Amino acid sequence: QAQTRDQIVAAADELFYRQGFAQTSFVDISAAVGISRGNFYYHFKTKDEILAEVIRLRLARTAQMLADWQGTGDSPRARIASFIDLMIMNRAKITRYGCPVGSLCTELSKLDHAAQGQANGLFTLFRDWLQRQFAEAGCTTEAPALAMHLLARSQGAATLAQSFHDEGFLRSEVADMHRWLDNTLPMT
């Protein structure tokens, strides 16, 4: 009953991504890890409380991940194709469950939830990072709008992808993404 708070945040994260936030319950979450009514209520009291920590968690899964992209990638366009190809990477989960960030922010946005701002920082995250890549890659002056555009590109791809249950399209789209990203960058 100490650091195992971090453990229930894990299960609620997966649950919120796979199930949606409003439709996941304590029973759901408490069953995942394995706890009773009192063993659970200890660490947690309200759903919104659990959601706070997952959004914290997610922001780590997202900047640290965005690290490994800066890592493996040894150039600008490299570190940014790491983003466009995460979609190819998680094509199965995206076509069934949608984008983790998008599906969360749009859900929180509809509900009119207090935390939409916190959730949207995962978008802000990716954004500021693609904004550095663009800077470093060739168009420092246009980086901001190219950030918002591509970010948007990917969400439209994941959106029709999930709804049409169409993994192919995700591929169609990521091709268009790459091609467009050609007529964009400079040679280095």
Q: Which stretch binds a copy of itself (CB under 8 A): 5-13, 35-43, 54-62, 119-127?
A: 119-127
CA distances (Å), 176 to each of 62, 99, 158, in order? 24, 18, 13
Residues 89/6, Cβ–Cβ less than 8 Å: no
Which of 35/55 has CB closer to a copy of itself? Answer: 55
Q: Based on CB atoms, which residue is closest to a copy of itself, 35 or 99?
A: 99
Distance of alpha carbon 75 from its chain centroid, rounded?
A: 23
Show contacts with a copy of itself in window 18-77 (CB under 8 A): 19-20, 22-23
DSSP structural state of residue 187: P
Q: Check binding of 102 to a copy of itself (CB under 8 A).
A: yes
Q: Smallest distance from the beta carbon of 183 to a copy of itself, in angstroms? A: 11
Question: Could you tell me if 143 and 135 are in contact, meaning their C-beta atoms sit under 8 angstroms apart?
Answer: yes
Question: Which secondary-structure segment (H or E) carries 63?
Answer: helix 47-63
Where along the sequence are the contacts to a copy of itself (CB under 8 A)? Answer: 19-20, 22-23, 96-98, 102-103, 105-107, 109-111, 116, 119-120, 123, 145, 148-149, 151-157, 159-160, 162-165, 169, 172-173, 176
